[PDB]
Amino acid sequence: EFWRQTWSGPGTTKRFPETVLARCVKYTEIHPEMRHVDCQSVWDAFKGAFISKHPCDITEEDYQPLMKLGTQTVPCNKILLWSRIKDLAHQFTQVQRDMFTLEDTLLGYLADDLTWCGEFDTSKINYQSCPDWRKDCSNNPVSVFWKTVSRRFAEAACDVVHVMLDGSRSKIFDKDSTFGSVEVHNLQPEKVQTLEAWVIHGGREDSRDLCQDPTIKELESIISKRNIQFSCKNIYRPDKFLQCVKNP
Numbered sequence: 001e002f003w004r005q006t007w008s009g010p011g012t013t014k015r016f017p018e019t020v021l022a023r024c025v026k027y028t029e030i031h032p033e034m035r036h037v038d039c040q041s042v043w044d045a046f047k048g049a050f051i052s053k054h055p056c057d058i059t060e061e062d063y064q065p066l067m068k069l070g071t072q073t074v075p076c077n078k079i080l081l082w083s084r085i086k087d088l089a090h091q092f093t094q095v096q097r098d099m100f101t102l103e104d105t106l107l108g109y110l111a112d113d114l115t116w117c118g119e120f121d122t123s124k125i126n127y128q129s130c131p132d133w134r135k136d137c138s139n140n141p142v143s144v145f146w147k148t149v150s151r152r153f154a155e156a157a158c159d160v161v162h163v164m165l166d167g168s169r170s171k172i173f174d175k176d177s178t179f180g181s182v183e184v185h186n187l188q189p190e191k192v193q194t195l196e197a198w199v200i201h202g203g204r205e206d207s208r209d210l211c212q213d214p215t216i217k218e219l220e221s222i223i224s225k226r227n228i229q230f231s232c233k234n235i236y237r238p239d240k241f242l243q244c245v246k247n248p
């Protein structure tokens with residue numbers, strides 16, 4: 001009964017509806033070029049993708065109404081992808097305002113850091129628990145959202161695409177991440193000339209060329225097989241890097 005939670009993962013972020021609406025309004029203020037959006041309609045489409053649906057049965061088609069309302073052209077040559085190093089990627093685009101992560105787009109901004117899910121055959125948002133991607137099920141409202149929007153983002157990228165990776169993780173490139181499983185395989189060689197990785201070093205660990213890490217070799221192989229050039233740089237001093245990006 002009431003002491004048993006449905007799922008293993010965190011539940012919907014508190015005040016999720018109010019937060020998504022408020023973020024939409026704020027985004028349209030910061031980015032007047034997305035001001036045409038009707039934020040109530042955006043919320044209605046977002047809610048519609050998952051309310052009353054079994055949260056292991058969500059599809060990319062469920063999010064298509066939201067994807068349509070959130071259509072946004074960003075400069076295709078100015079895209080920064082990332083994997084497991086969100087804070088530094090966002091700090092970078094806060095300074096370097098001509099480059100964009102997915103979370104700098106309306107749809108990514110709405111969802112960033114939030115969790116949500118519904119309950120099968122009720123109108124209610126589940127604020128207690130939501131599916132864990134590993135322990136429960138992969139086709140859940142959050143995972144499918146990121147898969148859908150990330151595919152579209154990667155498909156739109158062109159020219160030189162950059163990706164920030166965390167050189168302090170055991171898997172610098174992880175093939176089962178959203179970057180590895182969705183984004184890499186949707187970079188189109190007809191549009192994308194080069195994927196350049198920036199491998200961020202942690203602490204005082206600056207003695208190795210992490211572009212030689214086996215997972216980077218793996219990434220390199222995957223990209224080469226898509227007929228896209230691969231480039232890799234070490235960022236040994238991310239503190240100084242960011243300062244230089246601010247004060248070049």
Ligand SMILES: Nc1ncnc2c1ncn2[C@@H]1O[C@H](COP(=O)(O)OP(=O)(O)OC[C@H]2O[C@H](O)[C@H](O)[C@@H]2O)[C@@H](O)[C@H]1OP(=O)(O)O
Binds near residue numbers: 102
């Ligand atoms: N369990 C979870 N519950 C809610 N959100 C989760 C989650 N696990 C991951 N996420 C988010 O889901 C999104 C995709 O992450 P994930 O599947 O772990 O793989 P990733 O390679 O690190 O994804 C980042 C890349 O995917 C997006 O397109 C980003 O723009 C970026 O290029 C991220 O916003 C995650 O935020 P996080 O870095 O964990 O703070």
